[PDB]
Swiss-Prot record, chains A, B, C, D, E:
Disordered: annotated span: 17-40
Keyword field contains Manganese: yes
Protein name: Oxalate decarboxylase OxdC
pH dependence text: Optimum pH is 5.0.
Entries under InterPro entries matching the protein: Bicupin_oxalate_deCO2ase/Oxase, Cupin_1, GPI/OXD, RmlC-like_jellyroll, RmlC_Cupin_sf
Species of provenance: Bacillus subtilis (strain 168)
Length: 372, 372, 372, 372, 372
């Protein structure tokens, strides 16, 4: 491939990364309509350090990797069968999508109520900031995407149970529980983070009963069970605080785009959009106002971003289905469709703007079709 | 005029701007009670660049002009008869007051519901952040004041319909609507922003029906229709989220002060006050605490500002009525009257503070009179 | 005392402050488990400038003294019998705890409604931001702790009644009230702030009736009247917006820890904790995640702080009861108990984490006991 | 005047400030070539609060008035005959230009060396940061422009001699000088700032001799004595650290533009330009790159600004001479002339850029002519 | 490849980017010694938008792509034979390395002196901030790396000649040069940026003579002509202000590492290191102190970064030579070699630190060998 478009551009003369150029066709050779300075809106998990542990791994994309995403950060975590992500808590709220396998999660709220449940492929969970939780993969192991509502998410964001105890005077721990220092002499000297463990038993056998009762709302959500918004070119599954009650700071949508289809031109009137590409290949042009626009390519891993109110679309440029997540730090999902917008205005008024005739306004639809 | 007060000050000896000195009597010669460093709280639209277009003009006062106003910015827009302010949207919420003429506005919400209505002198509109809208002046043309809830409002805040399409690949636009590239070959190459157009027909003929139903609440408000708070020296018309339902981030008040009257000494316990002087001449002293106070003069255009909780009053120093707007970035209007405050406390307690007698406390009123 | 722990440390060889070293046993000789850089979380009112006035005094601990506390600041105020803290208002909300004596407070809201009441030892008050108020000590005088919801609280935060009038043109004041300049010639030339005054009469005689009616909710709260959460080692009295209705930005808890007891290991899932030590002596280790932890000593005065979500405990290390306040800038109090958390999880799962057996999990309690 | 240019713009329909519109012809009706968002680069001293004292006055334009000027602030000070600007010092360096009258200044350096001298119209002075100084007007009184090298210049920037003593324990002052508290009982209770005083005697009689010798370099500079750069349309007098040795942080140029002339198109490769218009009327277009440019009008007072490297010119649009100051926070003056730049490049290369022929390149001059 | 190291890690179960994983062996499977949160220190030009023009292209890596690099930004520019990078200037200083081909550059300083010269492969140029310049490729075309001393480098950083004129009133341009508006009617309406042009003639024929004389120092430097520091595993060519006189804000080093060799363990005691990989493949571990370290992989394009004082090395992990640039925003190059450091200390002292014997200290060298 060469950076040539018509009579513009030229061949690359210096040593280059041909493999990456092939993955970014629309960046090596952008649309003629691209223009102006626009921040980077793409980053691959494959370009991050992978923390390997006995029991799995974890890699992250944060504001230190993708500066534009100051409000959201993400971790791609993998657990082997039975492996446990140590009991912990953080300052940020946590949202997750199970891509592969399954796992059992636990969480106890500020009123001493516990919630334990199994999560499979296509399911989500949301843990409010500060509430302690854990994850343990089941027989197939597990690999999921975590999203935290602070782009600065880092090592100083998470508190591990064993790390806390390892840094608390033995005499204080003893006094706190009413035991002797000798009885807790075997406590770990360092945190575990992720550790191998035998597979757990049936969920029903793990349920713990308490004097505080059951939690008011579930911390897990079966996203694929609900009926999706079905368009001619694909489908959209949405989960925000209106249906997944506890998810107050994260609204999400799983979008599937068939080959030859595209997520239509639209924008979000509420907040920034954070994206994760599960599978497939795509291209998206972000319109940043005042004649500024830049096109980006995305595939598999890849994290994407669309700043608040910027116009965009997501086109499948591959032969396989395109599947990605749209994440928003808000209590609801909201979007404005270009097609629907114009369809709901007087025909001659739209014609006056576009210098087009009735032949164009005749194709506008008053019904919203997310994927065409 | 000379900067002389009693035995203080002196005549100006260097070349000067006599015209401006005449407009700022209380700045050239401030009250003896003024003291300390206080930020500038005044700026004139006449001191800004006027963007002229075929169909009208627009000038703005932002944080780049008035640094103290970081949360609110304003645009003075003028449209000729039939002229259209191109379909667009922005990150900020928009509030407006029609000073002269009338116009038809359109807006479509995130659920595909449209609202179209005509706005006349004394009417307002409020467009939630991110929702697309337009303005088209009627037979008398129109001139209004726009207020956006972010002082950094600029060119990167607004997204124009034709600018978006002009910066989107033709093949993508074609695919989005299901037409050929040839059918959209006549789309504008650049945005229009403001453009001349034939006057529209009757409002009833423009109303568009849709499968999503009518909007829950109107985006326009007839401010002058309601009964105002009538005081001995003037009247106050208030519009906040309690009566103009959709206006959640902007609370407003239209104040009219007759000659020889004044908006009484008061402060706002909720947020900063942004002002626009429609007509007349005035002076206001802002009390910034810790013995700091500065007096400013205002007239016609002029934008004013009163930081959160600072004490102030607005005195008419002219022969004609004084008319101005008080704007607040909040979901409600709130103020504390000095008179009412003292009137609601034990008489001897107030006397103990002011070193004054019953003769003074006897004039205090338990009823609030905004303009005396 | 010497900074020696086992074979670590050494004797101090340079001139030193032995008195302070004696007050900070756990800082001169920290637990072996302390580690890493942790910001200072302690400051004494005795290390601040005391503003002395005719009628009392006031000293403060703000972000300029304790940098970690950016959201909360405090003032220790003392009033002699009958002394008045001048009518004033500020940008910040104000919360208070009467430690000694009693006082009468007044406050008028934005609707012209007044609230006057007497506050005794153990009582609280909360004045919403911007609402004018006053304090006048009764026959025993008064000494209380004030907490403002902005760590930057300073001189530019408070507006005094007489200071406002002293910096307002006489002709404007006259016009505002409808009197002559001669009638207000005796107004103070400078603010009073705190001034001596004769003791007031009975509360019932001070109550002012108005055309706006009574306030919807009281601005004072009798904290010690309610039944506290009683544990084996002490008690906790909580006051947040769920019971003390008007206190929307401040949640509080008065904790009493008997000798030999401790506020258990816990953390707050909602926000930072600000502390004030009323009496006694203690030590607290703050766990800041990622193997970081630091221990601090506190006594009498002393202000403490625990950043959001950090693990902590408060142990009484003296022979007398330990009494302190836990303050949070939020509309509710919330905490997660380490004991309760583990008690509500499957036993073998906890055992897998701690490398401990049934003997340990058997002591866990599903009921929360704040002080053990 | 009306905001109309050809077929663009329209008449103003709302109440307006006709006087200011007349002063800003190029802002009400900007050049067709103006475009994009550009910060405000103009502010009038007449729009500022004038501090009046017994002996003169002072008004300032700081970053609180003109946000773009973060590195430089200015004060317009006026002193009556014999009046003294109290002995003081500040954190910022101070540069000055005597516009009217004359004054005697004093300054003592960190080595105890004193410098006393008289300054007349056209003379300058530069006081390094932190060095104490004073100003006393002579028989004609004085009015000058002060420039400080920090845009945040305010009340907290200046330390007055009597204010320091007024806030130092009497016993400490006594001990410091070896006198009794009784001997200093008459010290002022408050600062003087500016105060009336009898005219001083001859300069030679005020010169103080010391054991530390004379200062290495003078703190005053006779700008108009040197030969200026004389062009066909005016002249330029430059004073920077290369000729006015002590002026290390301020470089200056006094520019005079005859009617029908203009300061040529140029830019500064070193730093931002701060301007003060002494007399006349002008217009300047600032080119901010990327197709952004805005035109401003200036007259008498007025402060102007040109951010670092932006292209500009200053055209006299009046019938009288245009006189202004160009100030730079740097140790040298530097500029690049558009004409000279192109004149020093191959002719065909310039022709290739401008699409113009030899007829144009033939008029280019290799010699720099600041004012044409 | 799989993220597995011994008994740590696991196979990837979700869709992935195998191509990128293959390019980042040490990121997918980091050294066991890596630990802690470390910012991203790598970015590929292939992952950026390529601006294509008639005559070449340009792509950039700025702080918007690589957040850690706040002080330096870079552009990879390509010019076809004879193509011109339009006459322009910027706020930032510019440094360049010619990787392929050759070009003629022009620059005029603030004294009207011009410098024109040809630059070939291995040559550099440095243009001080604000000084106008141009680049025109010769018969082979050209491709080079530009480095600007501000990470925020963007569109608002560069001023183009034709863009300035296009946004300046025609009447002003006419007056500035003494021509009629008609004579300049053919000036471009928009900037050119990069445009095709006929190849220039011999350099000697382009040299322009002026009344200001020759520039004091050359703006170009033949880096490969000088004798490099030759080590056993490679060579280092250094150019800083001590030899390339005008390059005051950029110090550089071209490093060549043979297969099986490595840039030794070292750190820089002066400032941050910015890197560009010309050819080959490598891996570098950055030691960030306090037990934090992260390994990164680099190849062809790729930009790297090493924050101030962090320890590092650069190992060739390929079969071909590794060639990269080390750039520093400082007036000199400086480094501390771990080997040399220990070699210059008492043997037993080093042994006491490392718990190693004479066998190790015996291999230390007092001479610095950059590449081993
Ligand atoms: Mg464009
Ligand atoms: Mg005062
Ligand atoms: Mg440790
Ligand atoms: Mg333009
Ligand atoms: Mg380690
Ligand atoms: Mn988690
Ligand atoms: Mn979207
Ligand atoms: Mn709008
Ligand atoms: Mn008000
Ligand atoms: Mn208070
Ligand atoms: Mn706590
Ligand atoms: Mn001074
Ligand atoms: Mn200039
Ligand atoms: Mn350049
Ligand atoms: Mn290095």
């Amino acid at each position: 491939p060469q950076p040539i478009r018509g009579d513009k551009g030229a061949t690359v003369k210096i040593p280059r990364n041909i493999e990456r150029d092939r993955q970014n066709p629309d960046m090596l050779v952008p649309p003629e309509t691209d223009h102006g300075t626009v921040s980077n809106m793409k980053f691959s998990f494959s370009d991050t350090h992978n923390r390997l542990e006995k029991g799995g791994y974890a890699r992250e994309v944060t504001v230190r990797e993708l500066p534009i995403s100051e409000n959201l950060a993400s971790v791609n975590m993998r657990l082997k069968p039975g492996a446990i992500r140590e009991l912990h808590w953080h300052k940020e709220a946590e949202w997750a999508y199970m891509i592969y396998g399954s796992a059992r999660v636990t969480i106890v709220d500020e009123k001493g109520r516990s919630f334990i449940d199994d999560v499979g492929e296509g399911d989500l969970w949301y843990f409010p900031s500060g509430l302690p939780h854990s994850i343990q993969a089941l027989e197939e192991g597990a690999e999921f995407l975590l999203v935290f509502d602070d782009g600065s998410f880092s090592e100083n964001s998470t508190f591990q149970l064993t790390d806390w105890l390892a840094h608390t005077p033995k005499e204080v721990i003893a006094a706190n529980f009413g035991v002797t220092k000798e009885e807790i002499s075997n406590l770990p000297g360092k945190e575990k983070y992720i550790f191998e463990n035998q597979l757990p038993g049936s969920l029903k056998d793990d349920i713990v009963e308490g004097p505080n009762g059951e939690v008011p709302y579930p911390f897990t959500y079966r996203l694929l069970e609900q009926e999706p918004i079905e368009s001619e070119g694909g489908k959209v599954y949405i989960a925000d605080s209106t249906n997944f009650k506890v998810s107050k700071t994260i609204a999400s949508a799983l979008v599937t785009v068939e080959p030859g289809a595209m997520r239509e031109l639209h924008w979000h009137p509420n907040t920034h959009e954070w994206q994760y590409y599960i599978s497939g290949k795509a291209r998206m042009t972000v319109f940043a106002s005042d004649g500024h626009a830049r096109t980006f390519n995305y595939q598999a891993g890849d994290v994407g971003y669309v700043p608040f109110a910027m116009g965009h679309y997501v086109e499948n440029i591959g032969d396989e289905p395109l599947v990605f997540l749209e994440i928003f730090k808000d209590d609801h999902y909201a979007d404005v469709s270009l097609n629907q917008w114009l369809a709901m205005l007087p025909e001659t008024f739209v014609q006056a703007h576009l210098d087009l005739g009735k032949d164009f306004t005749d194709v506008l639809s008053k019904e919203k079709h997310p994927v065409v």
